[PDB]
């Protein structure tokens, strides 16, 4: 809700902030800083935590950590959930005028930015406390009060470092944003680890390798029966395989093809004869933004559901809202019934075939929520048809044979339809990809492709 003007005001001097670049950073240095932030993010994502009594307790974000750039048992356990949560919340509130913000003032913008970073910090600290008290690495009783505060310190300062790295990237020292950069990094690293992991585990046959391509090599190189070797390598359950590789490749091609879609509005420079050109309106007008917004909302809802179930599962409200069960063969909880179950994705194609009504409800929720998120996002950000017409007028672009009002009418025809239907199509592609089962999440592959395209468009400019 709105404050007087803001409540953060006393906190402002206490918050650290990276200095904006005093001069235009050259593109070589932009790439340098981006790569350095890449390396530190990877190191933190792989460097394990402390106090780990055991890594076998239920994780409330099992299906969303790789999607939100988090790895269990490492410094990147926080991911960027506080970042996107604070962002989305503040941006939506400011764009719909729930809060008394006046973004024309630079001081007001500074207060708004400080509130965003501060709220991200509170979100980090709160989810860290929830994690340690729910005991993702051993129960607090076995941990002890001397080590839980240590764990809180590591998680807090790791989230703080992530906040500063994202701020570093966003303020012009690097390319794009830390959110998208880290998400794409995690997805790509996880996917080719599943493709080429040299580690081995003891299955019923013996030591067998994790990577699909390595298994494809070894099975053919050690089995005289080529047909049996291929039968294992292609369809081995509970391990990555060439069928998942095919799913990844085909979803990559499909998302690239669909991303290539855009409607070409014929425009013209008003100060030069001829010079006809086109303004593109992509089918994925918001790119992966609706998916990211939905993923953050779902992560928050899932966390609150799992944390409520640990203390109030007896009550009828909690189970009507969502039911978690620890299915056989694993301690990981999963949604079985309730609204959270219907809003949760199905496990696979065959499993989705086992519940037509649940799949229908989830698909409807996906399409509707993604379309609504995109439609609200284009108006929250400066990308409504009004803003697009303003930008075109500022650039001095016109439509031949039309007035600026006709340009705006055409933009009203195209842009909202583009946003809504592209959000729906990205939801449908996410559903199909997760159904078809890539190495990582099919939605993860979609996110990786879209973020790579966005950074390519940034790189292209410079």
């Amino acid at each position: 809700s709105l404050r007087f003007l803001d409540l953060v005001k006393p906190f402002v001097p206490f918050l650290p902030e990276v200095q904006q670049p005093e001069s235009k950073i050259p593109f070589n240095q932009k790439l340098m800083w981006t790569g350095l932030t890449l390396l530190i993010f990877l190191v933190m994502s792989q460097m394990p935590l402390y106090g780990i009594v055991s890594s076998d307790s239920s994780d409330p974000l099992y299906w969303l950590r790789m999607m939100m750039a988090s790895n269990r048992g490492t410094l990147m356990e926080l991911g960027i959930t506080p970042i996107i949560s604070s962002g989305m919340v503040f941006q939506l509130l400011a764009g719909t005028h729930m809060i008394d913000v006046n973004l024309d003032l630079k001081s007001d913008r500074e207060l708004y930015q400080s509130a965003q970073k501060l709220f991200a910090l509170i979100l980090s600290v709160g989810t860290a406390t929830v994690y340690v008290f729910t005991g993702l690495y051993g129960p607090p009783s076995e941990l002890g009060a001397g080590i839980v505060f240590l764990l809180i310190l590591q998680l807090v300062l790791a989230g703080m470092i992530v906040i500063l790295l994202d701020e570093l990237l966003q303020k012009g020292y690097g390319l794009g944003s830390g959110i998208s950069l880290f998400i794409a990094t995690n997805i790509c690293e996880s996917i080719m680890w599943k493709a080429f992991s040299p580690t081995s585990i003891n299955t019923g046959r013996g030591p067998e390798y994790e990577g699909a391509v390595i298994a494809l090599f070894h099975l053919l190189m050690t089995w005289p029966n080529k047909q049996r070797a291929l039968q294992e390598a292609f369809y081995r359950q509970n391990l990555p395989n060439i069928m998942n590789l095919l799913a990844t490749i085909v979803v990559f091609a499909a998302v690239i093809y669909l991303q290539g879609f855009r409607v070409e509005i014929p425009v013209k420079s008003s100060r030069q004869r001829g010079a006809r050109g086109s303004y593109p309106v992509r089918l994925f007008y918001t790119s992966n933004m609706p998916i990211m917004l939905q993923s953050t909302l779902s992560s928050n809802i899932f966390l609150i559901s799992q944390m409520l179930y640990s203390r109030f599962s007896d009550n009828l409200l909690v189970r009507l809202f969502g039911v978690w069960e620890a299915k056989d063969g694993s301690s990981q909880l999963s949604a079985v019934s309730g609204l959270v179950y219907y809003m949760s994705p199905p496990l696979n194609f065959k499993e989705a075939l086992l519940d037509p009504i649940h799949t229908f409800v989830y698909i409807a929720y996906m399409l509707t929520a993604c379309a609504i998120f995109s439609k609200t996002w284009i108006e929250v950000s400066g990308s409504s048809p009004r803003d697009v017409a303003k930008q075109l007028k500022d650039q001095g672009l016109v439509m031949a044979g039309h007035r600026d009002q006709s340009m705006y009418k055409e933009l009203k025809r195209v842009i909202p339809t583009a946003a809504a239907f592209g959000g729906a199509c990205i939801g449908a592609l996410s559903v199909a990809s997760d159904l078809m089962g890539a190495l990582g999440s099919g939605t993860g592959t979609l996110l990786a492709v879209t973020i790579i395209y966005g950074y390519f468009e940034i790189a292209a400019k410079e």
Partner: peptide, 30 residues
């Protein structure tokens, strides 16, 4: 077996297409 049928169709199409492409590119010269 439906999976075996899918595997055989994929293998036939995949390997025949690679063979045809490599043919037209390099072996067509000979």
């Amino acid at each position: 077996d439906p999976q075996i049928i899918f595997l055989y169709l994929f293998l036939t199409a995949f390997f025949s297409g690679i063979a045809y492409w490599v043919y037209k590119t390099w072996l067509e010269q000979f």
